[PDB]
């Protein structure tokens, strides 16, 4: 596990990436970590926004499965040949492993400008894999061939950083990456890491909303999404609650909002808290993000002002707990026990101040027995 500390490069704005050696002899690739999908796919051709691609003809241990797969996302898709090859994770495993891999020969809106990765690692469940749940996921391959528990945890250390590293621990929990207690919330469904949101608070204040709005379709934890995404109706409630507590295409991400450095904008904004049901259903815990996490700096130090992006965008189908929230917490994907754990990330600090908080237990007498429709 200690060999896996700081095995990630990147930042929330662009994503976090793992380094991988693929095939014989090895081809080094920079792989995005996506707990929101279930395929291992890499560039298979030259493309305008990647330095490098995996050449299956240059690998003696590559073996084509003789079919291709298409994966559609919300915005952006790709189509790739499916093969098997031997992979090594240098920062974590001395031994190499045989996984399925798709080699992208057609994509649209997938490799974007300024991106550092040239592949993605789907860490979600078998049920989401394409073309079917029968295509053994990368982590399922890893569990079996590496003898590790069915658990991985993730820490991003990008808070404060200009939008324009971390650790992925495969097979458990690294105690040097947190302090305090881990709070566990059950996984409601095994496809996405779907969990149950009870309440949203904006500065100690509950939104009027019914608890089901939060799980409208589903509430998921997804490292491959940048922002905290909310169902259109919930998003509108949060904007109006934040706005009437602070002082515009800002909210909708058409404009940035700028301040001179003396103006210290981080105090004018409220804290946002998401309540989650504990394994004991009679209690809940609270994950809190400060302004520093959702009022995001664009440029970084250099000028005598800063421009800021709003780290919360609307969504149609899901409530997506993305990097905007994941930057605050060490997140434990405890597949073996069907639960997701949260602890505060010691690295989530700016100017010595924690930019996230965790606390509980709180009673759930108030809320319905099941917020999941």
């Amino acid at each position: 596990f200690l060999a896996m500390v700081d095995n990630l490069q990147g930042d929330s704005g662009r994503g976090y990436y793992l380094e991988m050696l693929i095939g014989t002899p090895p081809q080094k690739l920079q792989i995005l970590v996506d707990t929101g999908s279930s395929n291992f796919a890499v560039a298979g051709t030259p493309h305008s926004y990647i330095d490098t691609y995996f050449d299956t003809e240059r690998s003696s241990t590559y073996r084509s499965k003789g079919f291709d797969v298409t994966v559609k996302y919300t915005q952006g898709s790709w189509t790739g040949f499916v093969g098997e090859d031997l992979v090594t994770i240098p920062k974590g495993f001395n031994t190499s492993f045989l996984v399925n891999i798709a080699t992208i020969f057609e994509s649209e809106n997938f490799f974007l400008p300024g991106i550092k990765w040239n592949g993605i690692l789907g860490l979600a469940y078998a049920t989401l894999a394409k073309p079917s749940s029968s295509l053994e996921t990368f982590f399922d391959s890893l569990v079996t061939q590496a003898n590790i528990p069915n658990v991985f945890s993730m820490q991003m250390c990008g808070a404060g950083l200009p939008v324009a590293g971390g650790s992925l621990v495969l097979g458990g929990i690294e105690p040097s990456l947190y302090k305090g207690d881990i709070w566990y919330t059950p996984i409601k469904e095994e496809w996405y890491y779907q969990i149950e949101i009870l309440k949203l608070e904006i500065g100690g204040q509950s939104l009027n909303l019914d608890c089901r709005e939060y799980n409208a379709d589903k509430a998921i934890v997804d490292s491959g999404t940048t922002l905290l995404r909310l169902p259109q109706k919930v998003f509108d409630a949060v904007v109006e609650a934040v706005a009437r507590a602070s002082l515009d295409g800002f909210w909708t991400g058409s404009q940035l909002a700028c301040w001179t450095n003396s103006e210290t904008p981080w105090s004018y904004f409220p804290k946002i808290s998401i309540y989650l049901r504990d394994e004991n259903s009679s209690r809940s815990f609270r994950i809190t993000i400060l302004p520093q996490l959702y009022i995001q700096p664009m440029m970084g130090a250099g000028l005598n002002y800063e421009c800021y992006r709003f780290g919360i965008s609307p969504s149609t189908n899901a409530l997506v707990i993305g990097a905007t929230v994941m930057e605050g917490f060490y997140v434990i994907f405890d597949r073996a026990q069907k639960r997701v754990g949260f602890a505060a990330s010691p690295c989530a600090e700016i100017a010595g101040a924690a930019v996230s908080e965790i606390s509980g237990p709180f009673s759930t007498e108030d809320v319905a027995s099941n917020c999941v429709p």
Partner: nanobody, 110 residues
Framework: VQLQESGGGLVQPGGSLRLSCAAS????????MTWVRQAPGKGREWVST????????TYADSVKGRFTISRDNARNTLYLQMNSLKPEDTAVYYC?????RGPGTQVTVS
């Protein structure tokens, strides 16, 4: 995805055994297949993996040389051939694919 292992039993040390995994409910011939064992009082141990076309085979050092993984794609069957068995091969052996496994077959080497 359904899987069924057989072939286990009580064998003497230095003996030999063939395990079988009959697979149904998915296209076996497209699937990476893996054998894992679970010895008593020990952690689960990976044994051997085989790529779908059966030309790539990998083995645990502890079985390198004695065990042979193989598959018959036409008959949706996976094999593990085990020679020079020793008391520490006593384990339940599980055939496994896409996070699914069968009920196992116990092997006892006294």
């Amino acid at each position: 995805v359904q899987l069924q292992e057989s072939g286990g039993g009580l064998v003497q040390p230095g003996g030999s055994l063939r395990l079988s995994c009959a697979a149904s409910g998915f296209t076996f011939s497209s699937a990476i297949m893996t054998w894992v064992r679970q010895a008593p009082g020990k952690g689960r141990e990976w044994v051997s993996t085989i790529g779908s076309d059966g030309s790539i085979t990998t083995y645990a050092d502890s079985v390198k040389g004695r065990f042979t993984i193989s598959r018959d794609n036409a008959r949706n069957t996976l094999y593990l051939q085990m020679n020079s068995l020793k008391p520490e091969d006593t384990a339940v052996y599980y055939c496994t694919s896409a996070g699914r496994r069968g009920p196992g077959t116990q092997v006892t080497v006294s």
